[PDB]
């Protein structure tokens, strides 16, 4: 039925880091688990002495790499499961997400004509915010495997602090795998292009994309023709990210490294802060202010230029390009109107932020059949609009942030597969928001690559 | 002071391999835990679907590098804790053990003048054999954290199948960390050598090694002066190994690649002295998997039998797939080893000859601790080298037990550690280990042996 | 008026090499200079103790590289002046030829999707065969600056053996320069693509080629995006070749190196043997049999399958792929009929030869205005036909052999510049056959690159 | 026994630079040939359009590497024939001189623990100063193959402007060859070290250097063991240099790159002891060109004047653009050098301090030959190092005269060369050179100096 853990050290914080961290977690914190302090402390004590998912050296490396995005010289690709589950944390599914993301990154690398830094939603994306604490069945809402259970049973939905330790054990495990995969041949560039050629061959819309797939093949053969040294072509770096929601988890995964000493959050390389949680004097923003990881903020349609600037000033006080990513998620019918003024006010500060586009969360809607769904064409249209805004202003479309899987699910309408509302019942397997399946995520990759080319 | 942690099914292995496997595991198995079989089946069912600790392509890469050891063109360095514990599975401890190993590997690379394959006793070394069924305090013996608890307490010593899952969790976590470390510049050659130079400053015997340390420093500077793209100098490959002993664990971590069947709890495993029953389940398991394998050869070993191991575990003549590990004792290796090497080189197979200068040189001190004398250890390595020099075969590698902690479990070395001192920091959970300073010392002496 | 040289050693040949070389030069030799033996010996003695233009190590390297062409995995680009002159042996003109050739090689590399081994007609192409010893003015025919003078003066046309030493001094000098250029930044791949982009921008037919120039730009940016190591991109190897015509020069430039000892001809990396000189028991073919350099044979429209095979057997006796290049030069109206049977008979021997195409020398004709000229469209058409033959037979179009310059001469009709017979008078500067100028050689590069793509 | 060889115009240099240049060359010039000025103009007109021996980007690359010498992070090695001859401009001789130089550079790279910039006296070193106007046989002095002939014969000694063109022809030919050699694996580090090991076998003093040779071998093996992409180990950069003396030649080889004016007969040139008249044409020429430049500083040098050279030849404070070359004598370098270094480091400019331990240590032996004692040479390098050690400045490089021929022109070394022996192979055309074995010997001793 269960395995067991014993309960025990960490070195003392510089007094200022202690004071600022304490000051930060004192502030109110939205969407937290409602569970006993007695027990959360115990779990935290376990987590305070485990090996971290990531290490500082990798996080400052990611920081430099992201600095190049902010300056206009690279492109950010963030993707993966909306909600990871302990039950799907298997080699096939991890391998599938890494695969999908890599396939997209080849196309975006060739189309942006510049590097793509590749960030997975993985090894920690186990918690989610909800708008209601009672879902559409009278049950306490599901909030991710880190908090409670998906199964629609009263007792499954109780907030269980032991999931804090499970969440880490899965996280670590998955990360161990992706490291391995990416270092050992799965991320070989020729092997991924091969899968892309397969997609063109068997997709219905193969013709739509054969020309560009071929041009990539030839720019790739060109490398061998010029006798380049192929070592950089045999691996790729995938970085872990998740939404920093459960502050009991994040605080327990903090560690102290350097160039004076600083707090890194080693549950991941980079975290972001959601629409529901970005309260400006709230605890998530203050926590972000204390950690050295690159951080993202979701910006929704109620966002105002002046506010946005307040985020930039609190999170990027030292003008470190790449430290802060602002992620727009307006919806295709609104991004062209709402985003331009925000970008004007922010670029006018002298701060170099990464303008990332989330074309997913502003475009959900309820199918006639009862499924949370997103139509492919609206997703494409929001990325289109994003690009138009940035071209018109002379600013860098920094990247994109999508929800995808390597499984061939049926959760988003449209795309080359003409997935109908009737088809959604076949393999609707998400534990929260609907995902672009393997074919739709790759097709979106091609389309955005054409936007990049212009 | 305890809290509990609750717990899909994918394809099963192909029926024909499941059949061969069932047949192989029906052989009797030594040293297995006495826990119920339904519980055990359950935990195995869990592990059968978790993400592996290693992936196959890494293992075939290791087989290639080891193939170069067997052919005489590289050298194997295998080291780490005797018995990993869950409570000492922390970032500092893993960091220090990786550190110590890398530090040895630098010196042995300069001295061997050939690559060193770096293998760590780590991520999975949670089970041990035991001779007695009742230990000195009248309790069930401690069999390793995979099986029971170290605490001298009736309940801690009960055999608990859930410790399988716990072990897996500690194994991947730790593995994850070494993967990150070796990729983020803890294995930057320049940095590791820096630590070695601090050691020459600090060590009571720093003068006996200033020469070789300086010579290494100048070969490194030499690489920089020749302007030689130092990317390969920024990272190292460290492989995971442990004694494959608990066949419930090892069998549940089997996974399928033509297609071969791999064990993805480690890159390589070995069969210990007490489990290599030629007709037992451990050797059979070693026959089925594709992982490299090692076998401990003790003083009771005969040439005739070693040949049986070659015929069994290297059927298709793959160089480096089998390592034979001498652990005789320094007063015995010179007599007992040469005949075995003779008989086995005769057969045509290319094996790795690896020296374990530790597990046959342990004695009990009047301070009450079980310990090992540094000089006896060094001397088994000296004898190992003298054997192979005499016979024209390749001295393949070492296989030592070490730590990065400044610990006090082995007598001697430059710190001249007394039996009085043993009580200071005797932190081991099983055998005594060379501490950080002693392991580096040994690396310098073995370095002189290779020149 | 003149500089002076003193007359002097070499080590003795293995007796078998001596015997075979003696046996070879005893055979009759066509198109030789008619000048005193007394003096030719003297010049030879000077040349027997000079530093060579090339060294053996480079020639066996070229041999391996050409082996890859024969096996179908690379492509051969040979080009340069028809006839070098001592008077045009200046840094600007050498730099111009290297430049032109490099520009072509970028395009052909990208279009073949495989390496291009780059061979210049340079540092030795100072002698030529003639069909008549009296030209159209009653003067002894001009035979290249190695033999006599271009100037139409009786005394200029006397065969002067001192030109053997001049020829070397210029050769060495030019080679010194190209080495330098190619090693020091002229052959940087980005710097050459830049010139190509300039061509597209200012050419009249820019539109014809903008798409492919852009695709090359993007496959080139792709390399940096993937973080390749750029050292191989900063230089390129250019090899010297010329027609081995004056056997007094070639024999004096022989040296003995290794893997038993062999005779290398170090006046160049590779030599070829012309239509006028390929007599099968003649001295040129026998000389080729003795040297270790890769060798080419010109094959004209009177060529027969069986003969061709005799060349292959004499020149490639050890079946060393890449050792022998057969160079077709039929003319566009004839290549499709004459070449296929030859290729059938030769491939049927088990020998792997490089099928190189010379679309120049079969397409000369006399303008209405009196200029030796070649029409661009016929040149293109012969390369087209060459490719068609090889596709139809499943054999490798190995390369091409053109006559080009970096100067903006007017010597070939047609191309994007619509160069008319009236325009030929402007800058007709060749010392023998008409050359594709810079723009026409690059346009031809694009067209052949499209044939390679198919 | 002679045969004769007969002989476009492109843009001229920009008028404003032609103006500055004419103004600079109107200064008086020492040691120039006494040949007619119309003939000379003609030959210059020829050279003004020929292909250069070097190209500018190579020169600015050299300026970068030398900038690293001046800053203390690299070391300069300059060596080759004293006086190149047309008749010894052969593949074997160039091959042997490049060989000898590379062989020294390997040892000095291991010993310096920093890159060595490798500069050869080659492709252009065809003119020499002379003290006497009438030599010992009562003939016009031999001024170098660029000017007249070595043969003791009234006619050979006439100053012949066509030897300009001849020299150019020999300079590019030779240059071509070194370019090919260094690019085709005569500069493959593994091969060059091989020759060094043959030397330790062969040399009468092979035992004094077996230690350092072995240590180098093991650092090389070390690079291979760390698996370090050895492309940069397959080739070397060798630069051409000569004493810029015949201003007709050097001026005709000027060529225009913002745009700078370069001298493309060599990568770098120097002004000798007899031509550095501060207000003369040689220093002026050095002011105008962008090439690196060196100046010989003799025993009559004063600190005050050296400063004038710095102010003149390094106006825009470019580190490494100017090298100052000490040639005092071993009994003099310790006294005479320190004040100069003092005065010049004072000025703020970063120069290269280079030791010429040869041109101030030459004496006539009773066998009649002019020669140099090996120990005196070594000792001027020792004193040079001791000076710079004392003052905290960087000992920048050496500047020796050597050959790859097994020649007998300098006394001493491991072969203990007697004055009896000098007559054996005294093949030089001017100063006596260290032979192949002696130059390598010197490299090992200087290597010990750098440690
Ligand atoms: N290492 C480079 C190139 C590369 C290797 N594998 C890849 C897979 C996908 C995209 C790019 C790559 C990068 O990550 O950009
Ligand atoms: N190219 C490097 C290393 C090197 C290659 N070949 C060499 C020969 C000698 C000395 C050094 C080298 C250098 O010039 O330093
Ligand atoms: N060195 C490679 C790539 C290259 C460098 N410079 C070039 C110039 C033109 C064409 C290719 C190249 C080659 O020669 O193929
Ligand atoms: N990567 C090489 C060299 C190397 C890098 N870091 C190291 C640390 C220790 C020893 C060797 C290395 C190896 O594993 O051999
Ligand atoms: N985990 C601690 C913070 C901490 C981090 C690192 C330390 O070294 C010490 C303390 C907390 O949440 O309060
Ligand atoms: N040059 C000589 C041939 C030769 C070549 C190399 C030698 O080493 C000797 C002789 C000839 O033409 O007859
Ligand atoms: N994912 C399964 C098995 C597992 C256990 C521990 C770590 C990783 C995976 C679970 O959480 O129960
Ligand atoms: N090492 C501790 C904490 C831990 C829990 C789970 C996985 C990894 C580590 C234990 O085993 O109890
Ligand atoms: N090309 C000129 C000048 C020159 C001389 C010698 C070598 C190279 C070029 C000539 O032949 O007269
Ligand atoms: N070195 C010989 C031959 C030679 C001629 C021309 C150029 C180069 C070399 C000479 O100067 O006479
Ligand atoms: Cl604290
Ligand atoms: Cl006990
Ligand atoms: Cl001969
Ligand atoms: Cl004299
Ligand atoms: Mn979501
Ligand atoms: Mn043990
Ligand atoms: Mn022609
Ligand atoms: Mn001299």
DSSP string, C326-339: EEE---HHHHHHHH
H or E segment at D238?
A: strand D238-243
Ligand minimally distant from the alpha carbon of residue A21: 5
List C-alpha distances in Å: D223 to B110, C238, C316, D146, D212. Answer: 9, 31, 41, 45, 17
| Contact partners, residue D148, CB within 8 Å, separation at least 6 | D33, D140, D142, D156, D157, D158, D159, D160, D163
Six-digit token string for C288: 């080729």
**How far does the centroid of ligand 16 lie from the alpha carbon of residue B360, in Å?**
10
Within 6 A (CB) of ligand 7 lie: A 86, 89, 166, 169-170, 173; B 7, 46, 50, 165, 169
- Kindly give the pairing relationship between strand D116-121 and strand B370-372: unpaired
**D273 belongs to an annotated ligand binding site:** yes
List C-alpha distances in Å: C10 to C257, D90, D391. Answer: 12, 11, 53
Q: What are phi and psi of C29, to 5 degrees?
A: -135, 120
C254/C287 Cα distance (integer angstroms): 11
* Nearest alpha carbon, ligand 2 atom 15: B226
Task: Find out whether B226 and D232 touch, Cβ atoms under 8 Å.
Answer: yes
B208/B186 Cα distance (integer angstroms): 27
- DSSP secondary-structure letter at A352? -
Residue identified by tokens 């307040």 is A310
Task: Find out whether A89 and A176 touch, Cβ atoms under 8 Å.
Answer: no
- Kindly give the pairing relationship between strand D352-355 and strand D397-401: parallel
b/e per residue A291-312 (b: at least 16 CB within 10 A): bbbbbbbbbbbebeeeebbebb
Inter-chain touch D174–C8, beta carbons under 8 Å: no
List C-alpha distances in Å: C135 to C132, C143, C367. Answer: 6, 11, 18
By CB neighbour count within 10 A (0-12 exposed, 13-18 middle, 19+ buried), where does C131 fall? exposed
Sign of the torsion formed by the C-alpha atoms of D98, D100, D101 and D104: positive
Inter-chain touch D2–C3, beta carbons under 8 Å: no
* Cα torsion through A19, A23, A24, A26, rounded to 10: 140
Sign of the torsion formed by the C-alpha atoms of C309, C312, C314 and C320: negative
- CB B181 less than 6 A from any atom of ligand 4: no
- CB A46 less than 6 A from any atom of ligand 8: yes
Partner D contacted by B7 (CB < 8 A): no
**Chain D residues with CB inside 8 Å of B64's CB?**
none
Six-digit token string for B353: 């000859």
- DSSP secondary-structure letter at D11? P
- CB B226 less than 6 A from any atom of ligand 2: yes
Six-digit token string for A348: 């006018």
| Contact partners, residue B327, CB within 8 Å, separation at least 6 | B273, B296, B297, B298, B355, B356, B357, B358, B359, B360
**How far does the centroid of ligand 10 lie from the alpha carbon of residue A397, in Å?**
64
Q: Return the partners of chain D (3 or more C-beta pairs < 8 Å).
A: B, C
Among A1, A2, A3, the strongest candidate for a mutation testing the B interface, having the largest count of B CBs within 10 A, is: A3
Neighbours of A185 (CB within 10 A): 16
- By Cβ distance, the residue of D215, D229, D230 closest to B215 is D215
| Contact partners, residue D10, CB within 8 Å, separation at least 6 | C90, C92, D48, D49
Six-digit token string for B288: 């089925």
List C-alpha distances in Å: A299 to A135, A372, A391, D41. Answer: 25, 21, 20, 78
Q: Round the CA-based radius of gyration of chain C to a whole number and report it.
A: 21
Rounded to 5°, the CA angle A410-A414-A419 comes to 40
D8/D24 Cα distance (integer angstroms): 27
Q: What are phi and psi of B111, to 5 degrees?
A: -80, -35
Partner B contacted by D190 (CB < 8 A): no
Residue of D nearest to C48 (CA): D90
Ligand minimally distant from the alpha carbon of residue D181: 2
Sign of the torsion formed by the C-alpha atoms of B123, B124, B127 and B128: negative
Q: What are phi and psi of B240, to 5 degrees?
A: -90, 140
| Angle of the C206-225 helix axis to the A91-112 helix axis, nearest 10 | 140
* Residue A373: strand pairing partners: A365
By CB neighbour count within 10 A (0-12 exposed, 13-18 middle, 19+ buried), where does A281 fall? exposed
Six-digit token string for B129: 């054999």
Extract long-range pairs of C213-219: CB within 8 Å, 24+ residues apart.
C215/A215, C215/A218, C215/A219, C215/C110, C216/C106, C216/C107, C216/C110, C217/C193, C218/A110, C218/A113, C218/A215, C218/A219, C218/A453, C219/A215, C219/A218, C219/A219, C219/A220, C219/A222, C219/C110
Q: What are phi and psi of D159, to 5 degrees?
A: -80, 120
Residue B409 exposure: Cα atoms within 13 Å on the Cβ side: 24
H or E segment at A265?
A: strand A262-265
| Contact partners, residue D187, CB within 8 Å, separation at least 6 | D98, D102, D181, D234, D235, D236, D238
Task: Find out whether A449 and A420 touch, Cβ atoms under 8 Å.
Answer: no
Phi/psi class of residue B135: alpha, beta or left (left: φ > 0; alpha: ψ in -120 to 50)? beta
Q: Considering only CA atoms, which of C123, C151, C125 is closest in space to residue C139? A: C151
Inter-chain touch C2–D2, beta carbons under 8 Å: no
Residue of C nearest to D171 (CA): C173
Residue identified by tokens 């139409």 is C152
Solving technique for this entry?
X-ray
A44/C206 Cα distance (integer angstroms): 67
- DSSP secondary-structure letter at A232? G
H or E segment at D309?
A: helix D303-313
Six-digit token string for C23: 């046996």
A450/A444 Cα distance (integer angstroms): 10
**Chain B residues with CB inside 8 Å of A54's CB?**
180
**D82 belongs to an annotated ligand binding site:** yes
- Kindly give the pairing relationship between strand C412-413 and strand D75-80: unpaired
Partner D contacted by B211 (CB < 8 A): no
Inter-chain touch A3–B7, beta carbons under 8 Å: yes
* Nearest alpha carbon, ligand 5 atom 6: A255
A116/B345 Cα distance (integer angstroms): 53
Partner D contacted by C36 (CB < 8 A): no
**Chain C residues with CB inside 8 Å of A115's CB?**
225-227
**How far does the centroid of ligand 13 lie from the alpha carbon of residue C21, in Å?**
10
Six-digit token string for A72: 């206009």
Sign of the torsion formed by the C-alpha atoms of C85, C91, C96 and C102: positive
Segment 68-127 of chain C within 8 Å of chain A by CB: 109-110, 112-116
Sign of the torsion formed by the C-alpha atoms of A346, A352, A357 and A362: negative
Closest atom of ligand 8 relative to the A49 alpha carbon: 3
Q: Considering only CA atoms, which of D334, D380, D343 is closest in space to residue D358? A: D380
**Chain A residues with CB inside 8 Å of B89's CB?**
50-51
Extract long-range pairs of A393-396: CB within 8 Å, 24+ residues apart.
A393/A340, A393/A343, A393/A344, A393/A347, A395/A343, A395/A347, A395/A355, A396/A69, A396/A70, A396/A71, A396/A72, A396/A355
Q: Considering only CA atoms, which of C38, C250, C258 is closest in space to residue C124? A: C250
Inter-chain touch B90–A50, beta carbons under 8 Å: yes
Q: In a mutational test of the pocket of ligand 5, which residue from A48, A247, A257 has the highest number of ligand atoms less than 8 Å from its CB?
A: A48
Q: Considering only CA atoms, which of D263, D43, D276 is closest in space to residue D164? A: D43
By CB neighbour count within 10 A (0-12 exposed, 13-18 middle, 19+ buried), where does B440 fall? buried
| Contact partners, residue B16, CB within 8 Å, separation at least 6 | none
Six-digit token string for D321: 């653009």
b/e per residue C2-28 (b: at least 16 CB within 10 A): ebebeeeeeeebeeebeebbeebbeee
Breaks (C-N over 2.5 A) in chain B follow: 7, 257
Sign of the torsion formed by the C-alpha atoms of D337, D338, D340 and D341: positive
Q: Considering only CA atoms, which of B447, B450, B356, B368 is closest in space to residue B401? A: B356
A442/A437 Cα distance (integer angstroms): 9
A121/A268 Cα distance (integer angstroms): 10
- Kindly give the pairing relationship between strand C254-257 and strand C116-121: unpaired
C392/C410 Cα distance (integer angstroms): 36
**How far does the centroid of ligand 9 lie from the alpha carbon of residue C166, in Å?**
7
Inter-chain touch D223–B227, beta carbons under 8 Å: no
Breaks (C-N over 2.5 A) in chain D follow: 7, 257
Resolution of this deposited model, Å: 2.8
Neighbours of B23 (CB within 10 A): 11
By CB neighbour count within 10 A (0-12 exposed, 13-18 middle, 19+ buried), where does D277 fall? middle
Nearest Cα of chain C lies from the Cα of A181 at a distance, in angstroms, of: 18
- DSSP secondary-structure letter at B404? S
* Cα torsion through C323, C329, C332, C334, rounded to 10: -100
- By Cβ distance, the residue of A6, A55, A91 closest to B52 is A91
Rounded to 5°, the CA angle B143-B149-B150 comes to 85
D421/A300 Cα distance (integer angstroms): 94
Task: Find out whether B417 and B397 touch, Cβ atoms under 8 Å.
Answer: no
List C-alpha distances in Å: B144 to B98, B121, B259, C412, D191. Answer: 21, 14, 34, 87, 55
């Amino acid at each position: 039925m269960n395995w067991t853990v014993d309960i025990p050290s960490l070195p003392p914080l510089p007094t200022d880091l202690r004071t600022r961290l304490d000051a930060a977690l004192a502030k109110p914190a939205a969407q937290q688990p409602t569970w006993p302090a007695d027990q959360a402390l115990a779990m935290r004590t376990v987590l305070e002495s485990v090996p971290p998912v990531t290490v500082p050296s990798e996080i400052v490396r990611l920081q430099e790499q992201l600095a190049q995005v902010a300056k206009g010289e690279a492109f950010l690709l963030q993707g993966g499961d909306c909600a990871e589950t302990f039950m799907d944390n298997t080699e096939p599914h991890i391998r599938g997400n890494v695969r999908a993301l890599l396939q997209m990154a080849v196309v975006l690398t060739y189309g942006a004509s510049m590097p793509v830094v590749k960030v997975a939603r993985i090894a920690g994306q186990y918690a989610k915010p909800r708008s209601a604490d009672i879902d559409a069945l009278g049950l306490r809402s599901y909030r991710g495997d880190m908090i409670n259970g998906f199964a629609p049973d009263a007792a499954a939905r109780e907030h269980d602090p032991s999931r804090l330790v499970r969440a880490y054990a899965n996280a670590s495990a998955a990360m161990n795998l992706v490291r391995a995969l990416t270092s050992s041949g799965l991320a070989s560039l020729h092997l991924v292009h091969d899968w892309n050629r397969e997609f063109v061959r068997t997709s219905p819309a193969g013709a739509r994309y054969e020309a560009l797939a071929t041009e990539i093949d030839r720019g790739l053969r060109f490398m061998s023709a010029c006798g380049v040294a192929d070592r950089n072509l045999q691996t790729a770096e995938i970085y872990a990210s998740h939404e920093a929601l459960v502050l009991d988890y994040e605080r327990a995964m903090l560690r102290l490294s350097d160039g004076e000493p600083q707090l890194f959050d080693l549950s991941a390389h980079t975290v972001w802060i959601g629409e529901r949680t970005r309260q400006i004097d709230g605890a998530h923003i203050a926590f972000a202010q204390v950690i050295a990881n690159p951080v993202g903020v979701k910006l929704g349609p109620n966002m105002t230029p002046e506010l946005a600037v307040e985020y930039v000033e609190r999170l990027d006080p030292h003008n470190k390009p790449g430290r802060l990513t602002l992620v727009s998620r307006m919806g295709n019918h609104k991004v062209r109107d709402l985003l331009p003024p925000i970008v004007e006010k922010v670029q006018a500060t002298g701060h170099q932020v990464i303008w990332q586009c989330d074309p997913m969360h502003g475009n959900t809607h309820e199918s006639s059949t009862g499924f949370k769904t997103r139509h492919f064409d609206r997703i494409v249209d929001e990325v289109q609009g994003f690009f138009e805004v940035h071209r018109a202003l002379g600013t860098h479309p920094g990247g994109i942030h999508v929800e995808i899987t390597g499984e061939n699910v049926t959760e988003c309408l449209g795309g080359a597969q003409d997935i109908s509302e009737t088809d959604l019942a076949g393999r609707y397997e998400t534990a929260c928001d609907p995902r672009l399946n393997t074919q739709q995520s790759l097709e979106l990759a091609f389309l955005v690559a054409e936007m990049l080319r212009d």
